[PDB]
Design an enzyme around this catalytic site. Structure first.
Site, PDB file in Angstrom:
ATOM      1  NE  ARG A  28      19.635  50.930  14.450  1.00  0.00           N
ATOM      2  CZ  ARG A  28      18.599  51.495  14.935  1.00  0.00           C
ATOM      3  NH1 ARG A  28      17.515  50.828  14.976  1.00  0.00           N
ATOM      4  NH2 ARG A  28      18.757  52.781  15.316  1.00  0.00           N
ATOM      5  CG  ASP A  53      15.188  48.182  18.709  1.00  0.00           C
ATOM      6  OD1 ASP A  53      16.244  48.344  18.520  1.00  0.00           O
ATOM      7  OD2 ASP A  53      14.237  48.990  18.315  1.00  0.00           O
ATOM      8  CD  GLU A 328      18.229  55.638  22.291  1.00  0.00           C
ATOM      9  OE1 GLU A 328      18.353  56.834  21.185  1.00  0.00           O
ATOM     10  OE2 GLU A 328      18.227  54.659  21.878  1.00  0.00           O
ATOM     11  NE  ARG A 344      15.017  58.561  20.424  1.00  0.00           N
ATOM     12  CZ  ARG A 344      15.056  57.526  19.631  1.00  0.00           C
ATOM     13  NH1 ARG A 344      16.049  56.791  19.650  1.00  0.00           N
ATOM     14  NH2 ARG A 344      14.012  56.967  19.071  1.00  0.00           N
TER      15      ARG A 344
HETATM   16  C1  LIG Z   1      16.594  49.052  23.975  1.00  0.00           C
HETATM   17  C2  LIG Z   1      16.052  49.444  22.752  1.00  0.00           C
HETATM   18  O1  LIG Z   1      15.285  48.828  22.247  1.00  0.00           O
HETATM   19  N1  LIG Z   1      16.659  50.557  22.240  1.00  0.00           N
HETATM   20  C3  LIG Z   1      16.072  50.993  20.831  1.00  0.00           C
HETATM   21  C4  LIG Z   1      15.413  52.415  21.202  1.00  0.00           C
HETATM   22  C5  LIG Z   1      14.292  52.248  21.843  1.00  0.00           C
HETATM   23  O2  LIG Z   1      13.350  51.521  21.344  1.00  0.00           O
HETATM   24  C6  LIG Z   1      13.423  53.691  21.960  1.00  0.00           C
HETATM   25  O3  LIG Z   1      14.558  54.535  22.508  1.00  0.00           O
HETATM   26  C7  LIG Z   1      12.238  53.443  23.053  1.00  0.00           C
HETATM   27  O4  LIG Z   1      12.125  54.748  23.660  1.00  0.00           O
HETATM   28  O5  LIG Z   1      15.318  53.056  20.023  1.00  0.00           O
HETATM   29  C8  LIG Z   1      15.735  52.714  18.702  1.00  0.00           C
HETATM   30  C9  LIG Z   1      15.402  53.266  17.561  1.00  0.00           C
HETATM   31  O6  LIG Z   1      15.788  52.937  16.592  1.00  0.00           O
HETATM   32  O7  LIG Z   1      14.727  54.416  17.619  1.00  0.00           O
HETATM   33  C10 LIG Z   1      16.828  51.593  18.708  1.00  0.00           C
HETATM   34  C11 LIG Z   1      17.435  51.329  20.136  1.00  0.00           C
HETATM   35  O8  LIG Z   1      17.916  50.003  19.655  1.00  0.00           O
END
Ligand SMILES: CC(=O)N[C@H]1[C@H]([C@H](O)[C@H](O)CO)OC(C(=O)O)=C[C@@H]1O
EC number: 3.2.1.18
Length: 472
Positions: A28, A53, A328, A344
């Site tokens: 991923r 995660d 993100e 996002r």
């Molecule tokens: C550090 C971490 O967990 N990042 C995760 C991120 C997060 O859970 C979300 O952005 C919380 O706002 O989202 C997701 C997702 O598949 O949507 C994957 C990332 O690996």
């Protein structure tokens, strides 16, 4: 005229919930980077046990010296060893997750910045109460260690020697300069030459020390085009404020400012949460930067800091507004010096912030573009020129869910605004988290997550396309 190559599986996942030939279940969070020597670096998260995660996750990369036609062996940057005594093996290992790549065009040093968590469920298993992670002693900063039964703050000083809360050295030491492959020995707790445990273990501990249950930000670098990598550098205390609960990067590829008074500055997308509404309404996007080629890092102000929402001002450290969040993101600099942040969000369409001082502060109004749908998933954008015209390419899922990956093309107008021209699909089916990079000679590459034929969570695949594929 317009050509798009078949998908090339770079990190092939397992099938129907089973591991692949290498014992890996899932991959991923891709990141694609074109180096100075023309090499392509594909980074990802190696999830050895499941797709969630958290768990035993390693930061791996692969290299290609032929613009993505062939790829070399897996190179592991970091892989903390799991806790041999954990009760639940799925959550019994320190975690590394969400890599961002970038290279400095002066020093040619390649950086890798990612999140780090001690044993647990990562961002979903954060201790409700705060635990101070660092202590400043006569200028120098030291990571804090907590001893079982005790309240004082031990510290890790020179050579990894553990010091008492009263500032006297002990017989315990931490492995601050690991030497094992993937640096799996980092955090090992020793008493002389007898291995006791790991400071990143939180359950069924064999040693008496541990760090705080907090969110950390690590950084490894490569001075040889990604062949070998340094030991992890803990950059958390340089950018993380005491009020921040979570601090993690926005996966993808950072940039280096190429014009303006801040040329040479490195930008890394990140986002935070406060202790008010954790992930329910405090997710705020921001950027960290280095003005000295990666030696020191600094935190910019968040986009949400002093933002007006529904007739009220807000701050990233105090907000509780689900819809005002921004997570993100991907960053891009225009030829006019301004910096754009594609974040996002939860508005259903694309949200874009602007900065005139190198990403430190952001403008009043957040621009929304209904032409580009945001299904609340990671996205990546890059700057590109064509016959003297300024463009920006952005890719993300087209909808209805994390499906039908899209490639959107926009014109950068003279005033700084964006005009979205065409929207061409690049991959049917599952599509989540991608990373764009310009390859040269009018060619562009993309690394993205995708599944088919019952492949586990996500297999990361690569494709090329030209400007003719971009112009409808
Ligand atoms: C550090 C971490 O967990 N990042 C995760 C991120 C997060 O859970 C979300 O952005 C919380 O706002 O989202 C997701 C997702 O598949 O949507 C994957 C990332 O690996």
């Amino acid at each position: 005229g317009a050509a798009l190559t078949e998908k090339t599986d770079i990190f092939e996942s397992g099938r129907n919930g089973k591991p692949n030939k290498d014992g890996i279940k899932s991959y991923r969070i891709p990141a694609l980077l074109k180096t100075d020597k023309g090499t392509l670096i594909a980074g990802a998260d190696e999830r050895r046990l499941h797709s969630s995660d958290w768990g035993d996750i390693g930061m791996v990369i692969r290299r290609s010296e032929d613009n993505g036609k062939t790829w070399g062996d897996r190179v592991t940057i970091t892989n903390l060893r799991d806790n041999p005594k954990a009760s639940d093996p799925s959550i019994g290992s320190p975690v590394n997750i969400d890599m961002v790549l970038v290279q400095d065009p002066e020093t040619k040093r390649i950086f890798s910045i990612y999140d780090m968590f001690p044993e647990g469920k990562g961002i979903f298993g954060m201790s409700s109460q705060k635990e101070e992670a660092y202590k400043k002693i006569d200028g120098k900063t030291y990571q804090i260690l907590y001893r079982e039964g005790e309240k004082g703050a031990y510290t890790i000083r020179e050579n990894g020697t553990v010091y008492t809360p009263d500032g006297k050295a002990t017989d315990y030491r931490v492995v601050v300069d690991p030497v094992k492959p993937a640096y799996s020995d980092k955090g090992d707790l020793y008493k002389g030459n007898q291995l006791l445990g790991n400071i990143y273990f939180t359950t069924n501990k064999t040693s008496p020390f541990r760090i705080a249950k907090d969110s950390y930000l690590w950084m490894s670098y490569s001075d040889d085009d990604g062949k070998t990598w340094s030991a992890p550098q803990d950059i958390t205390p340089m950018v993380k404020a005491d009020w921040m609960k979570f601090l993690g990067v926005g996966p993808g590829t950072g940039i280096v400012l190429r014009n303006g008074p801040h040329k040479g500055r490195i930008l890394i997308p990140v986002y935070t949460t406060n202790n008010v509404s954790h992930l329910n309404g405090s997710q705020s996007s921001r950027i960290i930067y280095s003005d000295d080629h990666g030696k020191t890092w600094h935190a910019g102000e968040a986009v949400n800091d002093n933002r007006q929402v529904d007739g009220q001002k807000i701050h990233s450290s105090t907000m509780n507004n689900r819809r005002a969040q921004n997570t993100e993101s991907t960053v891009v600099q225009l030829n006019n010096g301004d910096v754009k942040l594609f974040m996002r969000g939860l508005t259903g369409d694309l949200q874009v912030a602007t900065s005139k001082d190198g990403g430190v502060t952001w403008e009043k109004d957040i621009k929304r573009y209904p032409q580009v749908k945001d299904v609340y998933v990671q996205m990546s954008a890059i700057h590109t020129m064509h016959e003297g015209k300024e463009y920006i390419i952005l890719s993300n899922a087209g909808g209805p869910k994390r499906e039908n990956g899209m490639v959107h093309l926009a014109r950068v107008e003279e005033n700084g605004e964006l005009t979205w021209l065409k929207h061409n699909p690049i991959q049917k089916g599952e599509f989540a988290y991608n990373s764009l990079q310009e390859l040269g000679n009018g060619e562009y590459g993309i690394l993205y997550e995708h599944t088919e034929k019952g492949q586990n969570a996500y297999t990361l695949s690569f494709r090329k396309f030209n400007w003719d594929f971009l112009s409808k």
